[PDB]
Design an enzyme around this catalytic site. Structure first.
Site: not given
Lengths: 140, 147
Positions: B85-87
């Site tokens: 996840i890119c957060l």
């Protein structure tokens, strides 16, 4: 201590594989880049100099099961090789014959397994073994 | 002789006051490891689906961010093929002041409102053909997130 769960350990090994280590004479990566289970891996070993394995690239399959890295992975050569501990007909690596696998610790990794097999290629009992023709692979 | 108070507190709070649409259960062996299920948010292409997520609290938590990944295949500009996840808050914008609960609803909010702008094929598809990207997201929801 604190154990890193399988999936997160394997993500660490994934990232390290992509960055590469040492002189790049061993390398590893996911066999299927959509495999969310991170189970099946491709290993590569460059045969070491001054052995009968020299100038040959060996491909391997490494399988990290549900209990990895508490349990050792399963390893087999795809590229044909004559080497102690490797079944000469199937390429399967006999864990009892490879010390890293026979004495597995959860601190070990796909990297360590490949580095060990490469080190063992330099052993007196292996380095002089006559090899099959370059490029041949086992079935299955 | 065990976990830091914060982790005990956060663990027990996840099981006592669960985020709406989000279930979290402890791993049976690892007290820093959690199995999460997030319901596809209402009015999103993921609505009706349930998505497995895994969460791990590393040694350095909360100095270090929690580790989170999807285990259910999902078509989303901020989630890759392996579920990573890119957060912002999972790396760059992580601070000890944040908590696990904040991460989970942020991920949920991401599903409710995908951000294609984030510096992949999915995100690029979402920009140039959002309608098709949304229907693809719904397709993958039907295929991977209904059981």
């Amino acid at each position: 201590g604190v154990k890193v769960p399988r999936n997160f350990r394997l993500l660490e090994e994934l990232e390290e594989g992509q960055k590469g280590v040492g002189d790049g004479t061993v390398s590893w990566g996911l066999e299927d880049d959509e495999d969310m289970t991170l189970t099946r891996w491709t290993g590569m070993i460059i045969g070491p100099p001054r052995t009968n394995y020299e100038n040959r690239i060996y491909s391997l399959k490494v399988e990290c099961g549900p209990k990895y890295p508490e349990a050792p992975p399963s390893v087999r050569f795809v590229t044909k090789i004559n080497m102690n501990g490797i079944n000469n007909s199937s390429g399967m690596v006999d864990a009892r014959s490879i010390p890293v696998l026979a004495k597995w610790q959860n601190s070990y990794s796909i990297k360590v397994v490949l580095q060990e097999l490469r080190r063992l290629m330099m052993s007196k009992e292996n380095m002089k073994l006559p090899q099959p023709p370059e490029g041949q692979t086992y079935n299955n | 002789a065990g976990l830091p108070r914060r982790i005990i507190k956060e663990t027990q709070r996840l099981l006592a006051e669960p985020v709406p649409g989000i279930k979290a259960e402890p791993d049976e062996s690892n007290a820093r490891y959690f199995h999460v299920v997030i319901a596809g948010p209402q009015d999103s292409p993921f609505e009706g689906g349930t998505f497995k997520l895994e969460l791990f609290l590393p040694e350095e938590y909360p100095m270090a961010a929690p580790k989170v990944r999807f285990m259910t295949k999902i078509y989303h500009p901020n989630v890759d093929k392996l579920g990573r996840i890119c957060l912002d808050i999972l790396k760059d914008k992580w601070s000890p002041a944040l908590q696990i609960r904040t991460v989970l609803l942020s991920i949920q909010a991401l599903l409710s409102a995908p951000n294609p702008g984030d510096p992949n094929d999915v995100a690029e598809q979402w920009k140039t053909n959002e309608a098709q990207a949304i229907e693809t997201a719904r397709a993958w929801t039907r295929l991977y997130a209904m059981n």
